[PDB]
Structures are given as structure tokens and as C-alpha cells.
Amino acid sequence: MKVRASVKKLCRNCKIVKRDGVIRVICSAEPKHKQRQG
Amino acid sequence: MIGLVGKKVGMTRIFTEDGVSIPVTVIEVEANRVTQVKDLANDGYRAIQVTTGAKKANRVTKPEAGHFAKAGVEAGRGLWEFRLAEGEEFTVGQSISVELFADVKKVDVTGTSKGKGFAGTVKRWNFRTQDATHGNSLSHRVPGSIGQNQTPGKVFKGKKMAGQMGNERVTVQSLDVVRVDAERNLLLVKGAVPGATGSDLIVKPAVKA
Amino acid sequence: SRVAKAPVVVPAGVDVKINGQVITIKGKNGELTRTLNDAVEVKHADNTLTFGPRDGYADGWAQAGTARALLNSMVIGVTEGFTKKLQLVGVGYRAAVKGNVINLSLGFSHPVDHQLPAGITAECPTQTEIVLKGADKQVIGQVAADLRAYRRPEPYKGKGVRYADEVVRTKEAKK
Amino acid sequence: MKTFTAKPETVKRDWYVVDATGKTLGRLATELARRLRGKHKAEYTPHVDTGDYIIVLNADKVAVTGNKRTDKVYYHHTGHIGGIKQATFEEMIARRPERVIEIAVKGMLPKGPLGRAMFRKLKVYAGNEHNHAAQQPQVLDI
RNA sequence: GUGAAGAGGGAAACAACCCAGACCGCCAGCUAAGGUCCCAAAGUCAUGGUUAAGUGGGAAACGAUGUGGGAAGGCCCAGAC
RNA sequence: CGAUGUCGGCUCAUCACAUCCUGGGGCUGAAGUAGGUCCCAAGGGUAUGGCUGUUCGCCAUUUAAAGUGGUACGCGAGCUG
RNA sequence: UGCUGAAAGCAUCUAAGCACGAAACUUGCCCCGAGAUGAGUUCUCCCUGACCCUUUAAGGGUCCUGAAGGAACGUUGAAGA
Numbered sequence: 087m088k089v090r091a092s093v094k095k096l097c098r099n100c101k102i103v104k105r106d107g108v109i110r111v112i113c114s115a116e117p118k119h120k121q122r123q124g
Numbered sequence: 125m126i127g128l129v130g131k132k133v134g135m136t137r138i139f140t141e142d143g144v145s146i147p148v149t150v151i152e153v154e155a156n157r158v159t160q161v162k163d164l165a166n167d168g169y170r171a172i173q174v175t176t177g178a179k180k181a182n183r184v185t186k187p188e189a190g191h192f193a194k195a196g197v198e199a200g201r202g203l204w205e206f207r208l209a210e211g212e213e214f215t216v217g218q219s220i221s222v223e224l225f226a227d228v229k230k231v232d233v234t235g236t237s238k239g240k241g242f243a244g245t246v247k248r249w250n251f252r253t254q255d256a257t258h259g260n261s262l263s264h265r266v267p268g269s270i271g272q273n274q275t276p277g278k279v280f281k282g283k284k285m286a287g288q289m290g291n292e293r294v295t296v297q298s299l300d301v302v303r304v305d306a307e308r309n310l311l312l313v314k315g316a317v318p319g320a321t322g323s324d325l326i327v328k329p330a331v332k333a
Numbered sequence: 334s335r336v337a338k339a340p341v342v343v344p345a346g347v348d349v350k351i352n353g354q355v356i357t358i359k360g361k362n363g364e365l366t367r368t369l370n371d372a373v374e375v376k377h378a379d380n381t382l383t384f385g386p387r388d389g390y391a392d393g394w395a396q397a398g399t400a401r402a403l404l405n406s407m408v409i410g411v412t413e414g415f416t417k418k419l420q421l422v423g424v425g426y427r428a429a430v431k432g433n434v435i436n437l438s439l440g441f442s443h444p445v446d447h448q449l450p451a452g453i454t455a456e457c458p459t460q461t462e463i464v465l466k467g468a469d470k471q472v473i474g475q476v477a478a479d480l481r482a483y484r485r486p487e488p489y490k491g492k493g494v495r496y497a498d499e500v501v502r503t504k505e506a507k508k
Numbered sequence: 509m510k511t512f513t514a515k516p517e518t519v520k521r522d523w524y525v526v527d528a529t530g531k532t533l534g535r536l537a538t539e540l541a542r543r544l545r546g547k548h549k550a551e552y553t554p555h556v557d558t559g560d561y562i563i564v565l566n567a568d569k570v571a572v573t574g575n576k577r578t579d580k581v582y583y584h585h586t587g588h589i590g591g592i593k594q595a596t597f598e599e600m601i602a603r604r605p606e607r608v609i610e611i612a613v614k615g616m617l618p619k620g621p622l623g624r625a626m627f628r629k630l631k632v633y634a635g636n637e638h639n640h641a642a643q644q645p646q647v648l649d650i
Numbered sequence: 651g652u653g654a655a656g657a658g659g660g661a662a663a664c665a666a667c668c669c670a671g672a673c674c675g676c677c678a679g680c681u682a683a684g685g686u687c688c689c690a691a692a693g694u695c696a697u698g699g700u701u702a703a704g705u706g707g708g709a710a711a712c713g714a715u716g717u718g719g720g721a722a723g724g725c726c727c728a729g730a731c
Numbered sequence: 732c733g734a735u736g737u738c739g740g741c742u743c744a745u746c747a748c749a750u751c752c753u754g755g756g757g758c759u760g761a762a763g764u765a766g767g768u769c770c771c772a773a774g775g776g777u778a779u780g781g782c783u784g785u786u787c788g789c790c791a792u793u794u795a796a797a798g799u800g801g802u803a804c805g806c807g808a809g810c811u812g
Numbered sequence: 813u814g815c816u817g818a819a820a821g822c823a824u825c826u827a828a829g830c831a832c833g834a835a836a837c838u839u840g841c842c843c844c845g846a847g848a849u850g851a852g853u854u855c856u857c858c859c860u861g862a863c864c865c866u867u868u869a870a871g872g873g874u875c876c877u878g879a880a881g882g883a884a885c886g887u888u889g890a891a892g893a
Contacts, residue, residue: 471816478831
């Protein structure tokens with residue numbers, strides 16, 4: 087999990103979802119791609 | 125579970141055939157005679173109030189004399205109270221002896237600790253003494269500093285300072301019961317319990333198992 | 334929206350009971366119940382149920398689609414039910430059922446015995462397979478998740494409990 | 509002719525009973541504080557406690573809007589160096605439900621001896637019953 | 651311009667900001683800035699919207715299918731995403 | 732500036748988290764043991780000596796760890812000089 | 813970290829609903845504690861006389877009476893300036 091101020095999609099499988107008022111990027115394919123805005 | 129009220133006879137040791145010397149404290153636990161049973165209906169909680177020992181008939185005042193008289197029990201040297209566990213009943217005139225602790229393994233003994241009078245910071249809170257030489261001036265056992273310079277312009281509550289040490293209730297937890305001598309109203313506990321010889325002790329089953 | 338528009342067909346032998354928002358669905362595989370969200374307007378058109386947005390709420394279609402899916406899953410449960418298959422991977426890993434408690438041995442120094450809920454039944458075809466069955470989709474999914482959670486499948490060899498259909502992305506250990 | 513001033517001996521005080529079920533905490537507290545102060549009576553005087561006694565029942569069922577039920581924190585300091593305690597709204601309702609109404613009303617009342625005197629007439633209960641049936645409180649729809 | 655050399659009301663408190671210049675008395679009235687749920691005087695005022703963050707009640711580059719309004723544009727029952 | 736005593740040490744602390752250890756977790760160029768980095772978390776704990784007035788620093792040997800800081804770079808109407 | 817699940821035919825830990833999760837929080841362990849003026853609860857003991865006055869009321873005064881209990885004094889304590 088990358089805690090960044092700027093969260094973006096990194097590949098075609100990265101999906102942006104807002105959980106508990108926080109923007110998060112979750113990737114089904116690559117575990118290295120998951121980030122959370124913080 | 126309820127406990128009993130005894131008296132510290134002193135300390136001694138018990139030799140086991142394996143060659144181990146267990147240091148024990150001899151507690152003489154005479155019969156505790158119940159004097160009042162408290163319930164949810166009248167007092168809002170469940171407990172029993174017991175007494176033990178005897179008191180001088182010209183020394184017992186009339187209010188407590190009448191209180192004992194209602195229960196129909198001879199006056200003891202004090203009154204102690206034990207909270208009742210669930211599903212534990214007792215009648216008013218009932219006498220409870222030291223055989224209650226026949227198969228318990230550890231107890232919690234609470235008594236009023238020895239009084240050390242006005243104790244210094246070094247003795248009371250294990251503070252370090254300052255230098256006995258190297259030029260020191262009238263400050264060998266003083267507590268040193270107690271605050272900071274003008275931003276928190278007061279001493280903080282709960283600071284460790286000199287004062288009355290001891291003569292307060294202290295509980296020693298999880299002592300091994302070495303022997304229950306029901307025949308002569310004795311209880312031998314492993315270790316040292318608080319309080320001087322002849323003081324009252326409250327022995328209750330170990331809360332921490 | 335698009336999910337909520339398509340109605341669900343209620344088969345024979347399955348009786349519904351609409352009581353305001355709280356709804357019960359009885360069938361041959363048991364009887365499930367659920368308290369719906371007030372913002373959903375559901376009605377039975379004598380052979381099927383239809384879902385519409387109750388007025389006065391912004392998220393009408395979203396709740397309606399959620400309600401549609403929930404009742405559809407309930408209908409699947411009360412007629413066919415759900416069967417979730419899990420498989421164990423690794424040497425010495427095994428499971429067994431004793432009425433309603435699964436005894437897992439997943440290379441731990443103690444046994445791991447998980448108590449099953451009321452409506453869930455298990456069955457092991459082999460030593461390394463568990464077949465869960467139940468009407469409620471949420472409950473069977475939750476028990477499946479908890480069982481996999483004890484020893485989640487690691488990526489280097491895939492050892493641990495895993496679902497029958499899921500794939501594990503194996504990773505090579507570079508020395 | 510100088511203005512009339514109430515007198516503490518001859519001032520009459522009535523007893524009221526309010527059901528706090530499902531009512532907004534602050535919107536109920538304002539009316540409660542106003543009546544305890546006595547501002548709802550023409551004979552009001554700033555330095556005399558001319559208010560009425562109020563019994564508030566069903567305090568543990570009071571309502572709040574938004575996410576205040578889990579986010580409103582009630583801070584209090586014990587006076588010791590590390591004694592900073594805090595408790596959320598739901599924790600206060602579960603542990604000491606009456607305290608929520610008490611703190612709210614006490615905050616909305618004046619400060620000083622007269623303020624504490626006004627506050628002393630509010631008797632709030634967690635349940636649906638009180639012991640003051642003898643005083644005959646009238647039901648007040650706030 | 652104000653303070654110095656200027657009091658009163660507001661900005662919690664706050665010489666210099668805003669409103670406004672105290673000759674004295676009154677248990678009279680109208681307003682300015684600023685306010686009108688309670689401390690604390692005055693709208694739980696009326697009509698139509700926006701916010702779900704206690705944002706209001708402290709801040710930037712940058713990031714995001716949060717959500718309201720408006721005008722176009724590209725693909726599309728020869729079937730769009 | 733009609734006096735607010737100042738570097739280091741001793742004694743005694745208290746707070747913050749940008750956490751040194753223990754606790755929970757994501758990714759790993761994470762096979763295991765042992766690590767790297769980030770997020771949550773201040774409840775408790777966080778060396779003894781050689782050298783110099785030293786803070787700092789180097790060194791010897793431990794420890795799970797030998798934290799970074801605030802408090803008049805805390806503390807002389809408590810001590811040293 | 814999840815289950816079910818739309819908004820957004822898919823996907824999605826969340827928007828409705830449900831589960832797990834740390835020495836942090838509240839308890840659980842020990843001690844003080846109704847001056848908690850919101851001064852609480854329970855058990856027990858003691859007192860069951862005659863009259864005057866004026867400003868007539870939680871009023872003042874005289875005689876008889878002195879209880880339960882407390883205090884003072886003395887011998888003192890592993891309690892204590």
C-alpha cells in the first residue's frame with residue numbers, strides 16, 4: 087500500500103473506489119499498484 | 125466467593141520432606157458469625173456482614189450491642205463485609221469456619237500495612253540520594269527539583285513527595301495456601317502478608333485465579 | 334437503475350410475505366427474512382416482484398438495484414441454495430466435520446475448530462476439500478472467508494485454503 | 509414608580525414533565541434552559557430564580573442528527589498531569605445517559621451561584637419513571 | 651484615517667481595524683457597525699436552492715465516477731458503452 | 732539594563748509522535764531465519780564505562796531498545812562551579 | 813482484512829446491511845472516595861416534663877431533667893512531628 091497525496095491509476099486493471107471518505111486505488115492484477123490518499 | 129477475617133499470629137517456616145523450606149505466615153482465623161445479610165430488595169446489592177473475636181461487655185456501646193442482639197450473636201471486635209457471588213446463600217445466625225478454604229489454591233490477603241511515620245522521599249519513593257561529598261551543601265537527601273521555570277508555573281498534581289508512608293490498606297495477591305488446620309482455627313499462607321503482629325487480616329479467594 | 338428495471342420471477346412453491354418493508358420468503362430450502370430499506374418500493378405483480386424508487390430520496394435507483402439483487406439471491410437460496418467449495422493445498426493439511434464443527438489441521442501446533450452457524454452444513458468429499466451449503470448467500474460467503482482467513486494462500490507455493498474457482502498468482506523466488 | 513422585581517419567597521414555581529424520546533438534544537436543551545431561567549414568564553427578573561421545576565424522562569433515547577452519535581466527544585480533565593479523559597456520545601449514553609442532558613443544559617445556563625441554583629431544579633432520569641409523582645407535574649410538549 | 655491626546659457599541663478578550671466624537675441629569679424614543687436558539691437584548695421569520703464534510707469553525711502545488719446548474723460535442727434500434 | 736543568574740554534570744521529572752523496542756497490518760528486488768519501506772499505536776521501557784568542563788563525537792562491552800524533540804536548548808530562593 | 817451489493821448489466825470492504833482486528837480507549841487488578849452541597853443507602857441505640865412573656869412565630873425566657881453517645885483526664889501502642 088502506497089500512502090500518497092496524489093493517487094492515480096497505474097494500469098488497465100486499477101480501479102478507483104472511495105472508502106470511508108478516502109480515495110483509494112485497488113488493482114486486481116498487480117499488488118504493487120494499490121494506493122490510498124493520505 | 126466470600127472470604128474470612130483472621131489475625132496475624134506471626135511468621136515461621138514449614139519443612140517439606142523434599143528438603144524445601146516454605147516461609148509461611150500463621151493467620152488465626154476464628155469463626156465468622158454473620159450479623160446481617162444484604163440483598164437487592166433492600167440494599168440494592170448482595171453481600172454478607174460477618175464478625176469475629178470477642179469484645180469487652182462494658183466496652184461495647186449500645187447501638188452495636190443492639191445490632192448484635194438483633195442477630196442473636198455475641199459481640200465481636202469488628203464488622204467486615206463480603207460481596208456475595210451468584211448463587212451463594214447464607215442465613216443470619218450462621219457461623220463460617222476456616223474449612224471454607226479447604227480446596228482453594230491461592231488467596232488474596234489484605235491488611236493495614238505497617239506505619240513508617242513521616243517518611244522521606246528516598247525511603248518512600250526509592251529516590252536517589254545526592255552526593256555525600258564533592259562540595260554538596262545541605263542537600264544530601266532532599267528531593268531535588270519539582271517543576272520547570274515559569275511556563276508551567278505550578279507543581280503538578282500527583283508529584284512524589286515526602287509524607288505519611290504506610291498505615292493504609294494493602295492487598296498482597298495470589299499467595300499459595302500451604303495448610304488449612306481446621307482443628308485449631310489456623311490458616312498458613314505462603315509468603316508475607318501486610319501488617320504487624322496481632323492486626324486484623326481479610327483473606328479472600330484469589331481474583332486473578 | 335438497469336439492475337432494478339429487470340424483475341425477478343418467483344417460482345412455484347415459494348411464498349412471499351410483504352409486511353411494509355420487512356419481507357419473508359418461504360420455500361423448500363428454508364425460509365429467509367430481510368428488513369428492506371424504507372427508500373425502496375416493492376410490489377408483487379401476482380407472478381413476479383417489481384422494484385421502484387420510493388419518492389423523496391436521491392439514491393432511489395441505487396437502493397432499488399441493491400434490493401433487487403438481495404431478493405434475487407434469496408430466491409436462489411430458497412429454491413436451489415448455494416454451494417461453496419473450498420480446497421486445501423499443502424502437505425499434512427486436512428479437515429473433518431463433527432456435526433456442526435469443522436476440525437482444521439493447517440500445520441498449526443493446536444487443532445483449529447470452527448463452529449458453524451445454524452443454516453450452514455459442511456461435507457468433506459476428500460481430506461483436502463470442504464463443501465459448504467446454505468440458503469443465505471451472505472452467511473455462506475462469510476464462513477468461507479473466515480475459513481480461508483486462518484491460513485490465507487501465500488504466493489510462493491499457493492499453500493493454504495482457497496476457493497475452488499479462484500486462481501492464485503504464483504510468484505517465483507529469485508535467489 | 510420603579511420597575512417590579514420578583515421576590516424569592518413569594519415566587520411560585522410549577523412542576524413539569526417532559527418526555528425526551530426522539531427529540532433533538534440542543535433544540536430541547538434551549539427550551540429547558542429558558543424555562544429553568546424563567547424567561548417564559550412575564551415576572552422575569554435577572555437576579556431571581558423565577559423558573560419552574562422540570563423532570564425529564566427517557567433521556568437515554570435522545571436523538572442527534574448527522575454523524576454526531578459516534579463523533580461528538582465529551583472532554584474533561586481530572587486535574588492531574590496525564591488525566592485527559594474523553595468519551596464519545598454513544599459511550600456517554602451507554603455509561604451515564606443523564607450526563608449528556610446535564611452538561612448541555614449546564615452549558616446553556618448562566619455561570620455563577622444563581623446559575624447553579626437554576627440548574628438544581630432539573631431532575632433527569634434515564635428510565636420512564638420518576639419518584640416525584642407527589643408534586644403532580646404537568647406534561648409539557650416541547 | 652485612527653491612537654498619541656479619545657471615552658461608548660462590535661471583532662471572545664484586543665491603544666492603531668469597523669461604527670461613532672462623552673457639558674450634566676432621565677427606570678423615554680429612533681437607528682449605525684454588528685447581530686436576533688441559550689449564556690446574552692432581538693426572527694427556532696417568509697420563499698427558492700446548495701452542503702453531509704461539524705465543511706461552516708485556519709492553508710498550497712497536486713489527486714478523485716462526491717454532488718447541483720448551463721451550453722455544446724462523438725458513437726448509437728444499418729444496435730452505441 | 733532602579734539585575735529575568737548563564738555551559739555541562741547530579742537529583743526529580745512532565746508532555747508531543749515526525750515510534751528506538753514490544754503490539755497490528757499493506758507492498759517487497761519478502762523461499763526460511765533475518766531485513767527494507769510505509770500506515771496505525773505514547774500503555775510501559777528506552778545502558779554502563781575510557782577521553783575532554785564538555786553538549787556533541789569516537790571507542791570497549793551489553794540490551795528487545797540504548798529514540799528525536801518541547802518544558803527560560805526544563806530544573807543554582809534544590810545541589811556543583 | 814473481509815461477506816453480500818448497487819450507483820456504474822461488469823467490477824467494488826460501503827452508499828443500505830453484516831463479520832474480524834493492537835501493549836492505544838472503557839472495563840477487568842490494587843488504593844482513596846457521599847464536602848458526590850446531587851452531602852446517598854442499610855442496621856442499631858437514646859430522649860414521650862410542667863410553665864410564663866409580646867412584636868404570634870422555624871420567637872424569646874424560667875424550673876425540673878442530662879439519656880444514647882462524645883469529649884476531657886490517666887496507663888499506653890509494631891499508631892504517631
